Write a protein that binds this DNA or RNA. Structure first.
Lengths: 152, 80, 127, 202, 60, 97, 104
RNA sequence: AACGCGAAGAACCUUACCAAAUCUUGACAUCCUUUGACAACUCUAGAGAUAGAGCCUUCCCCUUCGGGGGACAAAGUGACA
RNA sequence: CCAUCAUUAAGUUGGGCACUCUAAGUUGACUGCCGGUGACAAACCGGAGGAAGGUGGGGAUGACGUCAAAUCAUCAUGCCCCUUAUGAUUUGGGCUACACACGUGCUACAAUGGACAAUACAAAGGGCAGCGAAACCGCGAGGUCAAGCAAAUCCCAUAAAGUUGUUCUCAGUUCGGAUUGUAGUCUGCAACUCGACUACAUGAAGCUGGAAUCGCUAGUAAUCGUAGAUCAGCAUGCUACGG
């Protein structure tokens, strides 16, 4: 029911492993087909190469990795007819936390391996330092409405 | 209909018992469709009725493993 | 510490006891650590008794009943709840207005009639 | 009008059972014997304006309960016209015994009472206003609030069917605990049939 | 067709594996259940009269 | 003894089993209380159209309603509840002894 | 006879005629077979036990030819069980409408 | 609102389709009347129903008469099914 | 239905533990309720009050009515026929054919898996001489007879998917498994067209799918299935129910 405009946002649960709502919201994103026991336990094996390439703990590195995915300018195409409609949108932190995690489990499946025992381990610690993989959520909107700043 | 009596027809076979006394005839308005073949009545012709008109085709010894139902062409299907 | 409570979840019910000393788990005289395999919501199964601190304090001796083994769970965390509100209602604001003794507020929606299965419309072969 | 039967709207919600028996085991045979005596039961009453029927089965006591809205013609004189249906009760099947009868005061207050009647006031096709204007206006003079009765199938002699209803008042025809009875007849006129859908109230 | 092959079910059929169960107010072999021997439509009308047992229609 | 009272609706088999749980209560009996058994319903999933129109399917309802009454003191000056005929409409005589 | 190499006795045998679905239960049982008997197997006395079992029937390339003349013999029987190999028809009388897009 | 539609089980049947077979008061629902009142089971030839044949030639009681309320349809004619 | 009794094989037996869950009759919610800025314009909003929070939830009568929507192929009946056949009767074919466009689902394209073996946990429902447990026979399909008893009490059936030790490495390889020959294993007067297996043989497509187009806002999509109706014999068709 979107034609009323704003719908209330859906809420999160913090897992007792980390006491973080986003750790289980990282669990709620990796659940392809909603597989709870079959993907979370294998994502628990798929931070073992994430923490192999990064000695810092997960609760610090997961707010480090998405901090290079949270943008300041995204694009919402407005009805302007024959224009590029590239309107800069400073994100509300609800969707800014949401959009930083949306492109993560979209991208693990086009690398050299195709096993989610380590597809989620391949994907995360390539996408922490604002270079490649999931930063094209953030860094490509920083090269989309900027060379054409005439179509805000 | 069971394999107790692994099925020979026994009203084709009985009517072939009602034929193998004297000489067997080539074309009768009969069916021979749901009826199997064993090699003790070879040589004889039988008009398998396809549905439009019964047409004769002879029983050889090489017809041992199967029934006489795949003989008469039913359709004139040809089409394309 | 002897308190009788019950609880249901998804075509599956329970009934509990309580026993003093420490806190234990005796679901049909076995554990729910190899029963429930994913090891996930059992970590938050203490959060029913975390607001009351009766996790390593109150032993339950659960006797569960019916339905799926996952439906065996979440009927015993409502099973502890009514037995805890007669044992320790000292935290009843963090038990009734938060968490434990509420209800089963939603369950599995039916295979929806007038349609194919659970609001799925039959696949239109037209445009 | 692309709707459903309103007499189906309150089967077991507001109404009671006209079948309150119990036939669980061997239901097939002793059902066909109910409808083998039934196909002549209505034709012998000679448009008696029957309301409905309530069959009862209890240890092979299949008892017949026909209403026959006009009385007298089913009794006879102390069991003379009643024994004839009792004789056919022992003649079609084995026992079927002890036929009964009822009557109705306020002669046009039921649903099928009017429906069998105002069908039979349409073979002659004479004053479809005034006979129904005698019916409906006296019905509220007999205690009614909203009564809705139509004349549907090919009035006048025409080759097209024209419905002609008469209805007013407060008419909660869809509430769950309201007793609504509704009917249909097959008064043909050798070009088309009069399916009449009646509504009455109290 | 119907009135001739209803006696084929009401009496002994040549092939009684055919099960050609018609009805009295319908000529119907293709909506007949085991406990009915009658079509689903005329039974529905005399479900609203009380010859078939008590069966409710609407409000679930 | 197992006097299961059975009918289609409960409201007929309520008062029907309330006939046997009351008339044997005034008898020399030790009636088990009214403990009705699980009551099976039957969906008759017909299709609501006539010939063609699919996505038009009508469900129906018929119920059996089994009960459980059992008394344990049979004596011939009391048992007019069981031998005396009362209410045979839905009540088939399920008088097991 | 011409099985592929560097695979198990349950993984290399299952291609040539007379082994397929068969090293699950039939070729597995009649041979002294392990789980991972690869190309390194000492196949002179390990084959020596299973070369007595590898030669048993016509399935060294020629049971196909035994069936082939019996595909001809069923065509000499002139049955639909060889006619649909010879006429595009799915041989067990199956759907010769649009959804038969491998056999015409 | 046609598309795994009507069809919720196509070796026979189903079949509504066609061809052979041998028949048109019909496999039927059966009225009246001759009421001939049951070839109510099986051998032979025929796809098989169908053609030649021996057959539980009668059955529920009473005014005292062998006649039927219930009796197979062997014929049928007016029909119509 | 086993906290506490022991002779727990849980005969879940003695008693009937049966207290609780557990199977049928009854009521609990109502912006009834407190604070408002919300001023009276009734509300709604904010909380905590009840089990439920704002009809707590689902439906249903779909309104007076529209599309002459389909069907005189379920029935009727206003018509014409039709009356050696537009009635037929049987079994022979076929209704499933075949250059085939659309549809519709099934299942693969694995290593979040496969497979070996394990361990589950099920609900709902069926039963009237039947479930087929189980002694049982066969790697197999499926079969040799008895048990029980019309059932809160008897059979399906351990459901699996979860995970657990292992082989492959992402691949058409061991992923599963179309197409065809052998077994006659089966119910059925009768299995070629035109029934089913799993076991032998064949062992394929298959790389997650363009443009399009579908639903799905939570137990939902998607997923693993379990039994029940039509039914001699036959489901990827149908209804429920578990996860």
């Amino acid at each position: 029911m979107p034609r009323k405009g704003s719908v209330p946002k859906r809420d999160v649960l913090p897992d007792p492993i980390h006491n973080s709502k986003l750790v289980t919201k990282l669990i709620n994103k990796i659940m392809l087909d909603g597989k709870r026991g079959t993907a979370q336990r294998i994502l628990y094996s798929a931070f073992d190469l994430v923490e192999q390439r990064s000695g810092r703990d997960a609760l610090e590195v997961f707010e480090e990795a998405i901090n290079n995915i949270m943008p300041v300018l995204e694009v919402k195409a407005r009805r302007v007819g024959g224009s590029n409609y590239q309107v800069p949108v400073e994100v509300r932190p609800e969707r800014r936390t949401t959009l930083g995690l949306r492109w993560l489990v979209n991208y693990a499946r086009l690398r050299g391996e195709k096993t989610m025992e380590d597809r989620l381990a391949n994907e995360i610690l390539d996408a922490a330092n604002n270079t490649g993989g999931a930063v094209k959520k953030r860094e490509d909107t920083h090269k989309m409405a900027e060379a054409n700043k005439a179509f805000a | 209909s069971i394999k107790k009596g692994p099925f020979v027809d026994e009203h084709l076979m009985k009517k072939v018992e009602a034929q193998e006394g004297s000489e067997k005839k080539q074309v009768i308005k009969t069916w021979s469709r749901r009826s199997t073949i064993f090699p003790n009545f070879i040589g004889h012709t039988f008009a398998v009725y396809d549905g439009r008109k019964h047409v004769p085709v002879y029983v050889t010894e090489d017809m041992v493993g199967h029934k006489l139902g795949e003989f008469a062409p039913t359709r004139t299907f040809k089409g394309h | 510490v002897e308190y009788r409570g019950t609880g249901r979840r998804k075509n599956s019910v329970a009934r509990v006891r309580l026993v003093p000393g420490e806190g234990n788990i005796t679901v049909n005289n076995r554990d729910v650590r190899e029963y429930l395999p994913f090891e996930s919501l059992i970590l938050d199964l203490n959060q029913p008794f975390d607001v009351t601190e009766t996790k390593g304090n109150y032993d339950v001796l659960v006797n569960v009943h019916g339905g799926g083994f996952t439906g065996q769970a979440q009927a015993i965390r409502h099973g502890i709840a009514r037995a805890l509100l007669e044992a320790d209602p000292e935290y009843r604001g963090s038990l009734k207005r938060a968490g434990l003794l509420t209800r089963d507020p939603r369950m599995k929606e039916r295979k929806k009639p007038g349609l194919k299965a659970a609001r799925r419309s039959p696949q239109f072969s037209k445009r | 009008g692309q709707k459903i039967n309103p007499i189906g709207l309150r089967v077991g919600i507001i109404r009671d059972w006209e079948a309150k028996w119990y036939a669980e085991k061997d239901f097939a045979s002793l059902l066909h014997e109910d409808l083998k005596i039934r196909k002549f039961i209505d034709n012998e009453l000679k448009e008696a304006s029957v309301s409905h029927v309530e069959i009862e089965r209890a240890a092979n006591r299949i008892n017949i309960a026909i209403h026959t809205g006009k009385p007298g013609m089913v009794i006879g004189k102390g069991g003379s016209e009643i024994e004839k249906l009792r004789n056919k009760l022992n003649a079609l099947t084995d026992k079927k015994v002890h036929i009964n009868v009822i009557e109705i005061k306020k002669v046009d207050l039921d649903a099928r009472l009017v429906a069998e009647n105002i069908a039979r006031q349409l073979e002659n096709r004479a004053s479809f206003r005034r006979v129904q204007k005698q019916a409906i206006t006296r019905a509220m003079k007999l205690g009614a609030k909203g009564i809705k009765t139509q004349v549907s199938g090919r009035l006048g002699g025409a080759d097209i069917a024209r419905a002609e209803q008469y209805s007013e008042g407060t008419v909660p025809l869809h509430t769950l605990r309201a007793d609504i009875d509704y009917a249909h007849a097959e008064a043909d006129t050798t070009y088309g049939k009069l399916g009449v859908k009646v509504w009455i109230y109290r | 067709a119907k009135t001739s092959m209803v006696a084929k079910q009401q009496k002994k059929q040549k092939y009684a594996v055919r099960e050609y169960t018609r009805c009295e107010r319908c000529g119907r072999p293709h909506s007949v259940y085991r406990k009915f021997k009658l079509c689903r439509i005329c039974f529905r009308e005399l479900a609203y009269k009380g010859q078939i047992p008590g069966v409710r229609k609407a409000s679930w | 003894i197992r006097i299961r009272l059975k009918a289609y609706d409960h409201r007929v088999i309520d008062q029907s089993a309330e006939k046997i749980v009351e008339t044997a209560k005034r008898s020399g009996a030790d009636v088990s209380g009214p403990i009705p058994l699980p009551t099976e319903k039957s969906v008759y999933t017909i299709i609501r159209a006539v010939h063609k129109y699919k996505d038009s399917r009508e469900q129906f309802e018929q119920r059996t309603h089994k009960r459980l009454i059992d008394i344990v003191n049979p004596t011939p000056k009391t048992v007019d509840a069981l031998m005396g005929l009362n209410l045979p409409s839905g009540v088939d005589i399920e008088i097991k002894l | 006879v011409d099985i592929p190499r560097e695979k198990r006795v349950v993984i290399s045998l299952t291609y040539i005629y007379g082994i397929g679905t068969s090293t699950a239960q039939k070729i597995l049982e009649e041979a002294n077979v392990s789980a991972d008997t690869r190309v390194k197997d000492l196949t002179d006395d390990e084959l020596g036990r299973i070369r007595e079992v590898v030669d048993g029937y016509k399935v060294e390339g020629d049971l196909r030819r035994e069936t082939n003349l019996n595909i001809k013999r069923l065509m000499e029987i002139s049955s639909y069980r060889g006619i649909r190999h010879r006429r595009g028809l799915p041989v067990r009388g199956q759907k010769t409408k649009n959804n038969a897009r491998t056999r015409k």
